């Protein structure tokens, strides 16, 4: 799109690695350095996708 197309989503930030051919569907909020952001604000707790 000229100035849109925000539905094509991917991963640019996450902490843990996954093993070869391992299965994962998670989309949970990321931690904030401190204890994680359970549906609330924090330091950054940037989104997975």
């Amino acid at each position, epitope marked *: 799109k000229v100035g849109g197309n*925000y*539905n*094509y989503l991917y991963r640019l930030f996450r902490k843990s690695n996954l093993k070869p051919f391992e299965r994962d569907i998670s*989309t949970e909020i990321y931690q904030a350095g401190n204890k994680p952001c359970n549906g609330v*604000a924090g330091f950054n707790c940037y*989104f997975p*996708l």
Partner: antibody
Amino acid sequence: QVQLVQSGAEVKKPGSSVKVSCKASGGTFSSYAISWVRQAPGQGLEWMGRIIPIFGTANYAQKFQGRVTITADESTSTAYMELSSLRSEDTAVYYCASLASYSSGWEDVFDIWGQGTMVTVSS
Amino acid sequence: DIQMTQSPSSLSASVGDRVTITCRASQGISSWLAWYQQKPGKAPKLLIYDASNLETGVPSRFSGSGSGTDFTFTISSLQPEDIATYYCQQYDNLPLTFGGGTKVEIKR
């Protein structure tokens, strides 16, 4: 079960910036890209508004750009739409829906629609 | 003006009729297209979300196919519950508009 809900039916007036709200239930609000559908009696689907709450980016249709705004407030778990310069064509059953079909492996088809309301703007 | 149209405004047919009806647009596309069914003032049904693809809930009576500027909506049988309208909407680009569709009634 996932579900979205707007507030009770109400009246909207032109010539001002009105604040419309609707909540999402089932998983964090940040997980779904929310789309607003002004389904009219004759016309069907709409794309006048799409917002990804956590990235904060939003796009609108050529009919609504410039004068509208969307704001997501996770404190109360709500997504807001600032609407202004209304026309008489707005008589439609409004829904705020989930366009979250990117993690599904399917290219952005709508899956969950809210209960929606019959907005009252006409005479 | 990317818009699709139908030719028999009021398509009439009895229960169990073979119809190969078409939705034509000014520009042809190979993807990002779907078809719906809808009542007056009610949400649309997710009948055909992709080219020649049928999703869950669709009866065997209806099916879709085609290519280019024209797409064929195949009807092996028209049930009496089908007092409704079809649509041939596209979502390829940003400046979108909705289709016109066709009206359906049961020949009696």
